[PDB]
Design a protein around this ligand. Sequence first.
Ligand SMILES: [Zn+2]
Length: 27
Amino acid sequence: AAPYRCPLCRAGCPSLASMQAHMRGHS
Ligand SMILES: [Zn+2]
């Protein structure tokens, strides 16, 4: 699958710093 495919929200991004920034909102 894509490098960082986060299902919790449904989205994939090749950058970790970007997905990590969203993890701070994953309440
Ligand atoms: Zn997510």
